[PDB]
Every structure is written in C-alpha cells, then in structure tokens.
From a paper:
Next, we determined the crystal structures of the two single mutants, Y88A and Y88F. Their structures were found to be nearly identical to the wildtype NfnB, with RMSD values of 0.38 Å for 428 Cα atoms in Y88A and 0.39 Å for 433 Cα atoms in Y88F. In the Y88F structure, the side chains of Phe88 and Arg100 are well ordered, at positions nearly identical to those of the wildtype NfnB. Compared with the wildtype NfnB, the side chain of Arg100 had been displaced by ∼4 Å toward the side chain of Asp97 near the entrance and was found within a ∼3-Å hydrogen-bonding distance from Asp97. Almost identical structural features of Arg100 were characterized in the Y88A mutant. Compared with the wildtype NfnB, the smaller side chain in Y88A and Y88F mutants exhibited a wider opening to the coenzyme FMN. The specific activity of the Y88A mutant toward butralin was ∼50% of the wildtype enzyme; its specific activities toward pendimethalin, oryzalin, and isopropalin were ∼42%, ∼42%, and ∼28%, respectively, of the wildtype NfnB for butralin. After comparing the efficiency of Y88A and Y88F, we concluded that both enzymes were more efficient than the wildtype NfnB, by about 2.3- and 3.1-fold, toward butralin, and by 11- and 30-fold against pendimethalin, respectively. In particular, Y88F exhibited higher efficiency toward butralin and pendimethalin, with a lower Km value than the wildtype NfnB, but Y88A was more competent than Y88F toward oryzalin and isopropalin, mainly because of its lower Km value. Consistent with the possible steric hindrance posed by Tyr88 in the wildtype NfnB, Y88F catalyzes enzyme reactions more efficiently for butralin and pendimethalin, and Y88A becomes competent for oryzalin and isopropalin, with larger hydrophobic substituents at the amino group.
Author numbering:
A (entry chain B): 9 to 109, 119 to 231
B (entry chain A): 9 to 111, 118 to 231
The structure:
Amino acid sequence: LSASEALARRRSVRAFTDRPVDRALLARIFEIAQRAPSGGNLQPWQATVVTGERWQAVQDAVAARIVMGREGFQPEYDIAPRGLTDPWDSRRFGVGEALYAAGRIAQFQQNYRGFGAPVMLFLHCSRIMGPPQWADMGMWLQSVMLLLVEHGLASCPQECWAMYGATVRAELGLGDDQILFSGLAIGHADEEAPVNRWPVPRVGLDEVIDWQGF
Amino acid sequence: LSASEALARRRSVRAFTDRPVDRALLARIFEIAQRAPSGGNLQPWQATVVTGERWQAVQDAVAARIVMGREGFQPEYDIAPRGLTDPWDSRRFGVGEALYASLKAGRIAQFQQNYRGFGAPVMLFLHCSRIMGPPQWADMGMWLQSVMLLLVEHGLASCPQECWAMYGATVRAELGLGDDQILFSGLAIGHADEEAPVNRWPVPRVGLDEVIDWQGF
Ligand SMILES: Cc1cc2nc3c(=O)[nH]c(=O)nc-3n(C[C@H](O)[C@H](O)[C@H](O)COP(=O)(O)O)c2cc1C
Ligand SMILES: Cc1cc2nc3c(=O)[nH]c(=O)nc-3n(C[C@H](O)[C@H](O)[C@H](O)COP(=O)(O)O)c2cc1C
C-alpha cells in the first residue's frame, strides 16, 4: 500500500470490531514510526499504550470525572483556541453534521470508551516542551496513523481525553512533569459501520497554498 | 513505494542538485497532504511556497539580519525549549556529531547554508494564525509529515527547517504576511544529491524502550 493510498484511506474510525490487535505488529509499527523527524532530533513524543483491564481502569476513572459534571473537567490545555472565529469553525461544523448526518451526550461518551477500540495509545511529553515539539509529536502521530492503515489496522486521534488529563495521568502513573496531548484509539475498523463510510471534507488548496516566484 | 518505505527513506536532506521542481507535481502532493487529520478538522496549516527570484529575496533579507550578529535575531518563539535537559539535549548533539563528521569556523560556515535551503530550488514556509494553540501546532506537524513522505514517494526530498523562525518578522515581511500570522518552519524542497556525504550517514533514533510504555498486555 503506497503512502498516497495510505493517506487517502486513513480516516478517523469511530467504530471498531473486537478483532484483537497483534502486539507484535504494533511494536513493529512503533519501530518504523520512530523514523519521524523532529527539530534537533529531540524525538519528544512519549507513549503509554493500554489494553484490557488497565484500559478499562482509565475508562472508569474518567467515567467518575464525567458524572461530576462541569467540576470533573481537568483541561490539560485549550483544545479549541480561545478566539476561534466562525469562519474556522465552519470547518468543524462541516464535518460535524456529516458525522451525524440530547443525543450528543450519548455519542460523546462513546469517545471515552475509544469507540470500542481494544487498544488506546496515550501520547504525552514533558511539560518543558514547546509548540514546535508539539508539532514534532504531530509528525510522529500521523506516522503511526498511516502505518496502521498500511498494516490493515485503523485509528482515531482523540483530544477529548485531554479534557481529563490529570485523571488520565494519575491512572497511568505518569508524573505531573508530563502533559497529555491526545489519545489514539487503535483497532480493527468495523468496515460495515455507517459512521466509518461517509466521505470526509477538506478545503481547497486556494485556501491553503500561496505560490511565489514561479 | 509503500508508506513504510517512505518513512524509512525520508531524511533531512542537506544537499540538493539544482534540478527544478515540477510546480504541477508539488500541487498534486499538496491536495493529497490535505487529507491529513486535524482537531475538529480545522486544517490550521497555511503555506507560502517560494522559488526563483522571490526565494532569492527572502534569502537576501535574512542574510542582512544575519550579519547583524545576534542583535539581528527576531525569534518567532522558542525553537529549543529553554533549559533543555537530558535525555533530550544529548540527542541533538549526537545527530550534530554525525552531520558534521560527514563533512568552530567551518562548523559555523556549514550551518549558515541553512539560510540558502542547502541549495534547494523551492522553499515552503509553513505558518498559521496566532490564535492557534499547541494542539493546532501538532496538526501542522501531521500535515508537514504528510508532505515530506509524499515527496519521498515521488522522488523528491526535503529538509524541515526551524532556522527561519529565528528571523520570522523579516521572512513574514518578504512574503508579505501579516502580523496575525506566525511562522512555524521552513521546508526546503528539491532533488537530493544522492552522492553527498551529508546525505548518506545513518541517522540515529532512540530505542522504543525510551518511547513506549505497555500496560494491560
Ligand atoms: C489531534 C486530534 C485530536 C482529535 N480528537 C478527536 C476527538 O476527541 N474525537 C473525535 O471524534 N475526533 C477527534 N479527532 C478527529 C478529527 O475530528 C478528524 O481528524 C477530522 O474531522 C478529519 O476527519 P478524518 O480524520 O476522518 O479524515 C482528532 C483529530 C486530531 C488530529
Ligand atoms: C520542525 C523541524 C525543524 C527542523 N529544522 C532544522 C533546521 O533548521 N536545520 C537542520 O539542519 N535540520 C532541521 N530539522 C531536521 C532535524 O534535525 C532532523 O529531523 C533530525 O536530526 C532527524 O534527522 P532525519 O530527519 O534526517 O531523520 C528540523 C526538523 C523538524 C521536525
């Protein structure tokens, strides 16, 4: 499977089968993903991969947070930018309706069970790391996501876990020197599920690339 | 070429031939790279791709700052974390070893080549709105790595370059970008000189032991 095809076929999967994931395969995938670049070769990404009973523990700890209402929230940072304008948000609303086309509470709690993935990756780093190092983490993460598709697996990046970073970090036994960026649900896609088959929009290049001197 | 092979063969190339880059191919690489994910599908990345005379103007303007010594610096942000400790600090000097081994004064001289994109014919400047936060910066990395892998797949090479953020204001000026924008990084783009010493040394990575923790398996 070519990089183009991997890129094309990678999507945020929100329904996984219970087909087990080969730990050997994941390990091999992480080996190659480490070839992602990073400023100064800092390789600042760190990951705690959980499954089974531990993975169920994280779910329950956060579940406890969730019933606490707005008091249970423990933001690691600002997920949505303060000062998001509505022309930016129309992008999320464009994908937001299509995902669906109150009830919302129900689907969003599925986030916190990783949409049924058997494995959950938690991507974190030292609190000393700055914005370019977070960009390095993105490079690694997208490397992982593409390798998963190539290898017959699927994934869903989830920043929703950062709503409860401290709880997650505590449950993972990570120090308060670490900060949680995102979760990544991992597993085999339910490839007959509707939520996994709608076409996902992107803006046109006219909104992205400016050419000069050509 | 498979995604695994792309990941494996992608390196930070610091010696390019002067074979031009096909504008058409670059355009085709960017529509596919746009399939990168992003929080909320915000797609926060923006890029200004320069070549020829424009790419020469950016070079000259930054060179003017460069001779100003350290009084000329215009950092967009903190490139290296201030107070960077081990294990991390040993990692950059170690790759620093291998990069120069395959080549004070001369050391300095080579580093300044950064500001000519190591001779690359094309330079992409990746930027975004200043409203964007750290998670949006990770979104940009996701996009950038998509581009770098697609290049490799199509026989092109690149060098991501944060060195340009040392003179962000000047670069933004020469590109005509507003101060609502912040420059993250450059990406030098071109055809790799596949006999260059600088391009053939094996690039180290830490073992998974330092990266991955497994729980419940
Ligand atoms: C850093 C990051 C965090 C994300 N967090 C979530 C999340 O918490 N819940 C969710 O449903 N999707 C999440 N996503 C998926 C995005 O909504 C998705 O990538 C975007 O809508 C584009 O859709 P696609 O990836 O299927 O192509 C996240 C994506 C990224 C890159
Ligand atoms: C965001 C970013 C900025 C970078 N900036 C520079 C740079 O300014 N100069 C340079 O020589 N290399 C730069 N690099 C390349 C890294 O040094 C390189 O990725 C690392 O040593 C690993 O080497 P490799 O990518 O060839 O495997 C940058 C990489 C990243 C991700």
